[PDB]
Amino acid sequence: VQLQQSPGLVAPITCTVSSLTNYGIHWVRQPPGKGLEWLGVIWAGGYTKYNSALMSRLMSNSKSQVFLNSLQTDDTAMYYCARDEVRRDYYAMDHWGQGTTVTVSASTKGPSVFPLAPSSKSTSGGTAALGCLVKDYFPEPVTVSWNSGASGVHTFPAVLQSSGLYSLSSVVTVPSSSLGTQTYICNVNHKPSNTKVDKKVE
Amino acid sequence: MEIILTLSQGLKKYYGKILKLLHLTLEEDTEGLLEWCKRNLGSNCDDDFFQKRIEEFFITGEGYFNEVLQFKTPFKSYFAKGFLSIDSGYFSAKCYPRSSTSGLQLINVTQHPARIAETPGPKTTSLKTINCINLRASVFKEHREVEINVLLPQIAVNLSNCHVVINSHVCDYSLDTDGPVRLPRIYHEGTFMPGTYKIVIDRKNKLNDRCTLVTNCVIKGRKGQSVLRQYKTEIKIGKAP
Amino acid sequence: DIQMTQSPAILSASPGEKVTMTCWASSGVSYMHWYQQKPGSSPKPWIFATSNLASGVPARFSGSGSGTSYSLTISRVEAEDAATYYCQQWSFNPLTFGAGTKLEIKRTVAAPSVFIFPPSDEQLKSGTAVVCLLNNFYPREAKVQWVDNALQSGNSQESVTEQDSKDSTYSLSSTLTLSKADYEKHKVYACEVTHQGLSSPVTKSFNR
Ligand SMILES: *[C@@H]1O[C@H](CO)[C@@H](O[C@@H]2O[C@H](CO)[C@@H](O)[C@H](O)[C@H]2NC(C)=O)[C@H](O)[C@H]1NC(C)=O
Ligand SMILES: *[C@@H]1O[C@H](CO)[C@@H](O[C@@H]2O[C@H](CO)[C@@H](O)[C@H](O)[C@H]2NC(C)=O)[C@H](O)[C@H]1NC(C)=O
């Protein structure tokens, strides 16, 4: 059984698990640039241990729940919940939630979603490109899926524009005579604004 | 600057601290045990906790028990009964939980009696001389082993250049350390030590050739008589001739 | 405080080759464990207590080493093994991770398929205004150059996929933005792609 965490924004957090009475729970972050900092652990009995670099600024169940000051921009990271399997070797965090991206910065923009319309060259007969352009979002990432899960999907990294807003593109390769038959809708989710847009692509 | 302890390492240090409280070892290694406790056991590991665990194991022993010496009618493997292998890595001990009879096996001692008067005696004492009130000598020439059952645990029997295994109703273990034989001491409204222990020595080894036991042999004592007596002795096990 | 240095940081191997990568500790440790992370998703535990594979991990993976120096070895390189691998060690208290090893698949050269998308009318209707896509190509190195036989230096934002899990190719998008009536001041738009997989530079274009 896998663990799942609650994205957000804070000024200059919850982990849902599925037993807190038996297992220590750990915190992990990744500063953008694939790095990693160990932060702390809460064991089943409630005792705590902290990383001395946090300067005791930071953590504390009945329904299988785990709960998280003077925040800095260095603390922008993907945050992972994780848990110890005790044996003759310790730590061994084997199940990790997906993580929540935290950006330390007062702006918010929901994304605009634009069609990337097909009609290119056809090698042998099953070659076509299609897409959606996801722009204007300043917050933590957007997720894109195609036809509610329906292969061939490439979702680019977001780029920070000079406005301070992000943009990315997602594409799929398909044939084309059948493109007009089975129909295409891209499903885009931005949690920081509660925006869900499903866009037909011409 | 800091050390994290594994399951086995923490258990062995736990056992070492328990052994130090039993007055069986003169040293212990207790680094990383507080966090090992707060990480596996979930509770603080101060002297009160250990004293209570010793109390519950050796007295008030009632039902099943895990390797950490906690009873109940990671560590959720409670076994039936019989013995526990208390091994710290530096010193091992085979300890027996309380049985319906452990009570009377156990003398008190919290207030030792008077020093018994002294008598001149010979220190050139061989093994076959058994007129002690405090001693008992058995020889198994069939397996070439020597057993020295003692009846007065309070009188000390310091061994020299020897390697023995001492048996008792509280804990069996082996000694090679020169000096006083170290006996378990439980604290429960006072200090309780076993009533009698047996010291087995393998003669047919080569390890106890130069073994000498120095103790105080007690001999029975008018005008009130009933005097108890005490004389030093050098009991040798030397199988040289 | 206890720094873990893994080597090499970047490595490539042809499919089916044996690979090995090291993790070095400033101070000796009892054991090393290794976690596999594959781009854009949650880390996966891969090898723990020096050499025990996590369940599901194929037998082509192995770990070894002692003291300060530990290794990870692959008897057969697989396409799914492109990924970053991180060591972390016990007996610290300040627990610490290595920086990771990114493992790429050195596959055959493959030429990009190239597609161009004009802005959607909804983009033209906003106050702001073309995408060139290169799909399923190798190697990663590519040159996309952008208008009426001209080209601007400013703008032209690039974005690259990670290596595909199955075929080990890359994809790249380039987006020319910030041209309101500027888009309308020119008629023909083209992207020119240079790649070592192409006989001649390939240009794709449209009119309007
Ligand atoms: C061991 O024998 C003594 C006999 O004097 C018992 O009496 C204890 O004496 C100490 C020291 O004066 C007191 O602190 C205890 O409270 C006494 N125990 C009582 C009154 O029950 C002693 O109890 C015996 N040991 C045990 C464990 O019973
Ligand atoms: C066994 O060793 C002990 C420990 O040294 C001896 O006990 C000492 O005896 C002398 C003589 O009365 C005292 O002055 C010391 O104070 C005792 N030691 C301690 C630590 O108090 C004991 O005498 C030895 N056994 C024999 C038979 O000599």
Numbering used by the authors:
A (entry chain A): 2 to 7, 9 to 14, 20 to 25, 28 to 67, 69 to 70, 73 to 80, 83 to 119, 121 to 165, ...
B (entry chain C): 255 to 327, 346 to 493, 497 to 516
C (entry chain B): 1 to 129, 131 to 147, 149 to 210
Question: Which lines from the publication concern this structure?
Answer:
Crimean-Congo Hemorrhagic Fever Virus (CCHFV), a tick-borne virus from the Nairoviridae family, causes hemorrhagic fever and death in 5–40% of cases. The GPC includes two structural glycoproteins (GN and GC) and secreted glycoprotein 38 (GP38) containing proteins that also can be linked to a mucin-like domain (MLD) and one non-structural protein (Nsm). The role of GP38 in viral replication and pathogenesis is still being elucidated, but GP38 is essential in the maturation of CCHFV particles. Additional studies have observed that GP38 may be secreted or localized to the outside of infected cells and the viral envelope.
The non-neutralizing mouse monoclonal antibody (mAb) 13G8 targets CCHFV glycoprotein GP38 and protects mice from lethal CCHFV challenge when administered prophylactically or therapeutically. In comparison, 13G8 mAb binds to the GP38 region of the GPC, which is of particular interest after demonstrating non-neutralizing protection in a CCHFV IFNAR−/− mouse model both prophylactically and post-challenge. With no significant tertiary structural differences between GP38 originating from the IbAr10200 and Hoti strains, a crystal structure of Hoti GP38 in complex with the c13G8 Fab was determined to 3.6 Å. The electron density around the binding interface is well-defined, and the epitope can be identified. A surface area of 783.8 Å2 was calculated for the c13G8-GP38 interface. Overall, c13G8 engages with the alpha-helical bundle of GP38 that is characterized by two main components. The first is the LCDR3 that engages and stabilizes the GP38 Hoti N-terminus tail. The second component revolves around the interaction of HCDR3 with the GP38 α-helix 2 and fits within a larger hydrophobic pocket in GP38. To explore if c13G8 had broad-spectrum potential for other nairoviruses, c13G8 was tested against the Aigai virus strain Pentalofos, the closest relative of CCHFV. Interestingly, binding was completely abolished and could not be detected via BLI when c13G8 encountered GP38 from Aigai virus.Fig. 1 c13G8 interactions with nairovirus GP38.
